[PDB]
Amino acid sequence: MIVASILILIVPVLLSVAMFTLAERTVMASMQRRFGPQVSGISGLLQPFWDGLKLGVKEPVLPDSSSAGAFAASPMISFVLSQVAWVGICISDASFQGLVIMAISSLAVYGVMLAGWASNSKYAFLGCLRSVALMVSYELSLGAALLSIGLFVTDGTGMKCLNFAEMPTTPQYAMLPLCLIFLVCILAETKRDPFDLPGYNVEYSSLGFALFFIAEYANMAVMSAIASIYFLGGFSALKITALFFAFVWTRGTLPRYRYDQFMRLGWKAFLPLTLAFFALHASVAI
Amino acid sequence: YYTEGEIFGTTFMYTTNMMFWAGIVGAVAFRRNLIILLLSAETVMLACNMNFLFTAAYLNDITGAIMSITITTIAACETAIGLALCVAYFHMRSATDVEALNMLK
Amino acid sequence: TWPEPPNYYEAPKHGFKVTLENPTFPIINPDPNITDAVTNMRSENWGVVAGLAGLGYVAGYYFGAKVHWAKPTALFTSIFLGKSGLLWGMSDSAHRLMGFKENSKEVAANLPHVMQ
Amino acid sequence: AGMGLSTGTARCYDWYMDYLKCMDERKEPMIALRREHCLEWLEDYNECLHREKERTRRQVIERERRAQLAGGSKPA
Amino acid sequence: MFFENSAILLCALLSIAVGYTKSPFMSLMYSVMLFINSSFVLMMLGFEFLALVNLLVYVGALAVLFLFVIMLLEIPATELRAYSRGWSTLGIFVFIINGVFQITPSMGPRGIITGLPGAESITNLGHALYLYFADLLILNSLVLTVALFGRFAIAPV
Amino acid sequence: GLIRNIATFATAVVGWSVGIPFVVQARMNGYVERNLATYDAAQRQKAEEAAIGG
Amino acid sequence: RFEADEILTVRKIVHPVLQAEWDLRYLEHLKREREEEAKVMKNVPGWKVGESTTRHRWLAPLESWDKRPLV
Amino acid sequence: YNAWSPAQRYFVEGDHVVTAEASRTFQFTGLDSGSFYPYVIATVIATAISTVFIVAPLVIAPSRVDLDKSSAYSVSFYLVSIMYLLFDIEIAYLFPYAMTHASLPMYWTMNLFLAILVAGFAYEWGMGALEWRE
Amino acid sequence: SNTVRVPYSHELYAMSRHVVFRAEKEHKAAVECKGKHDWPEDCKPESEALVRATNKLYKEIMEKSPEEFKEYAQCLDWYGLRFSRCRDKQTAFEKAFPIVDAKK
Amino acid sequence: GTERRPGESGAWKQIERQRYASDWENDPTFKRTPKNLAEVLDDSASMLLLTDVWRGMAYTLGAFFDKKVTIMYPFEKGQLSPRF
Amino acid sequence: TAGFVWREVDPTGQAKNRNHTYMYNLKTFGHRSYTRRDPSELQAAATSVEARVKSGELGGLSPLA
Amino acid sequence: XXXXXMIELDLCFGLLLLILFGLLSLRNGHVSLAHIRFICQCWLVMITPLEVQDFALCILTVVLLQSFHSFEALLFLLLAYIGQLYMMHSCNLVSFYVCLEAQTLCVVVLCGLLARGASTSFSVEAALKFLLLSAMVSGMALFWFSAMYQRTGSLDMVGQETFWILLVMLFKLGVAPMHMWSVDLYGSIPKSLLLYLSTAPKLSLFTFWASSWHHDFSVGVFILFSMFIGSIGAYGQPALRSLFAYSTINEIGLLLLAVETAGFHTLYQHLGIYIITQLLLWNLTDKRLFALCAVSLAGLPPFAGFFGKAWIFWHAMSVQAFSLLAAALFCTLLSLVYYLRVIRLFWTAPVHTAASFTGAPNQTTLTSACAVALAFAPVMLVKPFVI
Amino acid sequence: GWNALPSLVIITGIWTAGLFALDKVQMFRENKPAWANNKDGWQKALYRRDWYLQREEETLAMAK
């Protein structure tokens, strides 16, 4: 029963992640005055499937000068974290469900670090740290934004919690700057533009690479669901697709930042703003 | 002569005590470096926190949570300071020792 | 056994520092505010506050002269000593208001119609 | 100190208060001397905290059960 | 309750394993697993919030810095006597005396205790933190400031 | 030996999980026996007190 | 706040009823335990069933229905 | 978990209930509200899936042995990670306050905490500690 | 032994309004009994009377308007004691079974 | 626009220079200082709330609803000349 | 306080030494006490409830059949 | 009402103002902070309660603030003093642990920062050693505190578990054989920080012991360890730093002996005399007065060390503690050897004192010459004064 | 973009079908459309009491 529910959640996640990368390609083409994937199946409705099967039949190569166990487990760990985050999104009743998912997302930093130490690549050694530091820095601001959200989440019994079903069914018009900063932090968390400077999985291959991309896009969808629940006033497929459309829109229009530049931006513009907004919300909500 | 809850409480206490003494001894006994010493001290703090929370649940009192938070704060602060000091020492003594950071050799 | 339901909307009216006493003088206001304390502050409090502020100003101007930045040093130091002395005096005034110090001069000050 | 985690007070808080009351109301110059006259309240607080004696009684009961089932197996 | 007790026992197993191994990366991985399982078992004690606090802090913040320090400071020195010099017998003998047979346990004369699930109230926790131990909260603020200032003053330049 | 490491790790985990409970229960048995002896001694003490106290 | 106050009123009304039902069923369980103990310790000299360990304050049982392990 | 005392079973006697709990179905509305239990089973399932996807290309892909195929083609981190440590601890401190109906003096004490926090943070700002040239 | 139990949580929540209006004296007596003593044996008559009154009130409801009370309780059970979502059913039930006697 | 700002320079020598020397003010290519509340609000709207990403976003989105130049080889070919 | 205490001497001397921790807990939470009910009250209440059960203004002990 | 807790709010406000003021002063290109030092002294004065011990510790720290010149170290010392003062007010083991660990972290940071020259590496190593051993001792204290919390279910510091609390209290004073961390610290760290360590945490711990500590055991064997080991080591170590380290070990053993037989008046006065001597020690510029420290430590009659040891012996005999009294006498005798050695090393020598070049001409004459006026103290001391 | 529109509709339809199926499955499992509600120890106590009461009713159901 519980296992069956887990699998029923799993299937749309994988299918839709395949569709997300396909549609990201195709919308990028549409915004680039081209068609994109169209031959591989009806209107190209079969590209990610063949890509996954191809990387499945492709040969996995293991370096002989490192620890291959971590090399295997790091994409495995990231995929496990993505599945656990999805389960906590849909199959959970925890009182601090949002905090649970935040702590879960904090864990995905290791997979990049595990890969970076695993392979004997100097630029992997550097880029893994760069991406780690970026996500770590933005995690504090994400937590501050959730802190601000939690200042008004109340159930009927009168207890303040983080349950998703008790979130108001209305958008939060009074926290639009907080929503914008949270969306930019989400953008940063997924190594997307303008934070695609770090890849770490350069020496990876095959279904390991497939699982890295699965974890990346699954975390993107998880953050999208979090944002929809928090600011858009509910959880629905329409909002997920709209947020993904907007994210592709932003990726296809902007270049990326420099390392220390987004470091400075996050550490001098985003976290203090979230702190001030949290203080203001706490003051008013009294 | 006893119930399952007695089993669970006894197991909790014995495990916590063994964790405490393992985190106390094993790092120096196995002759690792300072980083492992800090990590084992962190483990000691974790075991003490587990015991405190167990006691608080045994009493339905609030002291255990305060103890937990304070232990977390102090342990993290001391670990970070020790790591900074260790990195400074590493840079300062690099040219002549290599095996500087293992004082259990 | 069965617990009491929580009162999520009522927090205990508790102060983390407790005097562990009962007042030994007639009680005017157990819980006066800042303005209450200011309204009945004694001239001795103001005098000691002014003296502390002036001493801080003089000392700060002397000590900042070595670094040629004496005026702001003295200003900040005087404000520091002034807020310290003001806090002390307000605390004493509140203590008198709460019956833990003599308030004979004040019992005939904050009772316009209960003067006698 | 005495505040409860899920309740306002601890589950044996009144017994600690009773022992403290007994200790306070005395007049002996020593707490150790004052410890002597209020042994019963301290013991009751101990039994509230650990319930040792009920455990011992139940253990004796099960010991007698084992004696009555091992030493005696009278069939129908 | 086979699996719950097995998870409880896994904690001390991982604790010994942390010092047992010679690879610093393996030690840190063992510590991370131990922290996670410790939080999960404490979750059986009804502390949802505290488990997440411990998880967040130690995994996301401290273990990351551990791995970073090791990776910036540790060329493999395992064969550098870490396997060829061994371990002190007195340490393991003392550890056995202390933790296997536990001649000096926490309970002392008591030999049996009952473990019972709790009821964590974040409302009561906040009441205590900000009404009963507010002074200690400010002291913790001062300690955090001590850590920050000391770290930034001990910078290697 | 990556798979060898996995095998040793799993064997250690299983052996620990099956062996530690036996020692824990041995401790429990010893403590129960000792407390039974203690209670019997206390009962005998109370009997003597009743006898010589009238 | 209005909804929470209404629910608080509801629970305040409810509490004594569940308390009373708990008390009655716990007393019945006590009586059954006393019956079992009397059946067991029939021949034990110096044994007394229903012996109160405490002196003044009654003690509730250590474990209850509400407090269960999460996972 | 299964109950082991009639008090835990609300003084309901019988054998049917014991076996019922032994092979019960998981239900949030049953006996395991806020259980966190599906996380572990999700972990098991994800472990299985990831292991299978690791194993499969080692079965359906030809292999060739080459020597060269088996070869790969700062303190700012210290500052950031330690600051993250401290600030995450501070956020954990702040979180319960956001989950309560705190009072005015509670608000003022929270503001005192935040004031000390921002004092240290701003000191670090003004000394060039947040400029990541190095 | 004898089986003593009270109706389910949804039933108790739905009929809790009638408790104060028709079972008040036993309510207050039990309140004072609990406030005075800690040994449950010493509140046995009050507790038994409270349980008997509760069950009698429950039987009174099912004897007069069982279907409306049934569906209101079902609505409450489906929504988990959230009275906001079953206002119509509450109104219909209170119409069928007034909490206090009308036109007496 | 092509104007420059203090803090938007991507270096350290230039950033350290402009925060410790007003040399950029003498440069006319740097956007001049706001002088009233209106100009301050304009600058805030420039920096916060993006308003620079928004234009390129809108143009790309219009490109989404725009036509394409893609050809279906081999069922379509290109244009060539006899000199090929 | 919960972790600190300050000791001072009464200028008047009308203060008697007591356990400051006991006073702290007393002013903080108060104290709850109970007494054993007199038996005759128990038989009186039981007889009254029995009479009300017999007369028919009180219900049974279970809502089921 | 919070009206009775104004001074703590004042402490917080003053710390915030100090942070902002220090930030602002640094943008001006200032290079000295004597204004900050005097402001910190004033804030220490204001935050101090009216207890004699509180004022003693406050003034002791106030004089000590003249020996530092970095803002951050000033802040660390302020916070360490806060921890010490509140340790004199700690009525529970939670606050006791927090104060100890805050003081330990402050000590570690202060030792680490102020190093210069090639000595830096050894200072770092000693500081890290102290941090590691402090962490393990703190974990021990937390473990036994949790055990006591379980057994008692209260915040009372009673029972068998208090023995380990006593052990942890011993470790902070360098009680031999838990003395070697003190020796290591004496080995490398500059004189100002060691000057701090010998006085403040020991004073605060003795006061907290006197106010809120009791136990049902003895510490006599540890007293024997401290006395004998310190005496022999100070005899045998040619290094002046380790000589004074083992001297400190012997003196803390003497203080523990005074503790075990109660009579805290002699404990207090001897602690004050020894702290005065340590203050005179670490700010010495002329070597002629250096032997006065030895004769004030060797128990020579005309100066205060002799009487400070003398009432201690009087109270030890007041309980007829024959064993530890004889041990203290023999260790006092053994002190004289290396004290005379010190006298030879820095009295029967040519007189030479380097002149200042960067101004600050003998910047500590006043405190030195003031601490010298201890020969006039025994006049007031001989009467029942400290009690 | 006519080429990406099929993918755009497919993503929404996939999530719709998955959410609808999960809704049906979890409704069959829990038998009330509110199981995701926040619950304290009070609601937990009520739920566990009710479950044990249903079990007790079944126990007494097999007695007549």
Curated annotation (Swiss-Prot), chain A:
It catalyses: a ubiquinone + NADH + 5 H(+)(in) = a ubiquinol + NAD(+) + 4 H(+)(out). It is found in: Mitochondrion inner membrane. It is a multi-pass membrane protein. Its main location: mitochondrion. It is an enzyme of class 7 (translocase). Its EC number is 7.1.1.2. PROSITE patterns: COMPLEX1_ND1_1, COMPLEX1_ND1_2. Core subunit of the mitochondrial membrane respiratory chain NADH dehydrogenase (Complex I) that is believed to belong to the minimal assembly required for catalysis. Complex I functions in the transfer of electrons from NADH to the respiratory chain. The immediate electron acceptor for the enzyme is believed to be ubiquinone. It holds the Pfam family NADHdh. Keywords: Electron transport, Membrane, Mitochondrion, Mitochondrion inner membrane, NAD, Respiratory chain, Translocase, Transmembrane, Transmembrane helix, Transport, Ubiquinone. It comes from Chlamydomonas reinhardtii. The keyword Translocase applies. InterPro entries: NADH_UbQ_OxRdtase_su1/FPO, NADH_UbQ_OxRdtase_su1_CS. GO terms for molecular function: NADH dehydrogenase (ubiquinone) activity. Belongs to the complex I subunit 1 family. One of its GO terms (cellular component) is mitochondrial inner membrane. Coiled coil: none annotated. The lineage of its organism: Eukaryota, Viridiplantae, Chlorophyta, core chlorophytes, Chlorophyceae. The chain crosses the membrane at residues 2-22, 71-91, 98-118, 132-152, 167-187, 207-227, 229-249, 266-286. This is NADH-ubiquinone oxidoreductase chain 1. The gene is ND1.
Swiss-Prot record, chain E:
It is a multi-pass membrane protein. It catalyses: a ubiquinone + NADH + 5 H(+)(in) = a ubiquinol + NAD(+) + 4 H(+)(out). Coiled coil: none annotated. Keywords: Electron transport, Membrane, Mitochondrion, NAD, Respiratory chain, Translocase, Transmembrane, Transmembrane helix, Transport, Ubiquinone. Its EC number is 7.1.1.2. The chain crosses the membrane at residues 1-21, 32-52, 55-75, 87-107, 129-149. One of its GO terms (cellular component) is mitochondrial membrane. PANTHER family: NADH-UBIQUINONE OXIDOREDUCTASE CHAIN 6 (PTHR33269:SF17). Belongs to the complex I subunit 6 family. Core subunit of the mitochondrial membrane respiratory chain NADH dehydrogenase (Complex I) that is believed to belong to the minimal assembly required for catalysis. Complex I functions in the transfer of electrons from NADH to the respiratory chain. The immediate electron acceptor for the enzyme is believed to be ubiquinone. This is NADH-ubiquinone oxidoreductase chain 6.
Swiss-Prot record, chain L:
Its main location: mitochondrion. It catalyses: a ubiquinone + NADH + 5 H(+)(in) = a ubiquinol + NAD(+) + 4 H(+)(out). One of its GO terms (cellular component) is mitochondrial inner membrane. The chain crosses the membrane at residues 6-26, 38-58, 59-79, 93-113, 128-148, 163-183, 193-213, 217-237, 244-264, 265-285, 289-309, 310-330. GO terms for molecular function: NADH dehydrogenase (ubiquinone) activity. Its EC number is 7.1.1.2. It comes from Chlamydomonas reinhardtii (Chlamydomonas smithii). InterPro entries: ND/Mrp_TM (IPR001750). Pfam families: Proton_antipo_M. Belongs to the complex I subunit 2 family. Keywords: Electron transport, Membrane, Mitochondrion, Mitochondrion inner membrane, NAD, Respiratory chain, Translocase, Transmembrane, Transmembrane helix, Transport, Ubiquinone. This is NADH-ubiquinone oxidoreductase chain 2. It comes from the Eukaryota. It is a multi-pass membrane protein. Core subunit of the mitochondrial membrane respiratory chain NADH dehydrogenase (Complex I) that is believed to belong to the minimal assembly required for catalysis. Complex I functions in the transfer of electrons from NADH to the respiratory chain. The immediate electron acceptor for the enzyme is believed to be ubiquinone. It is found in: Mitochondrion inner membrane.
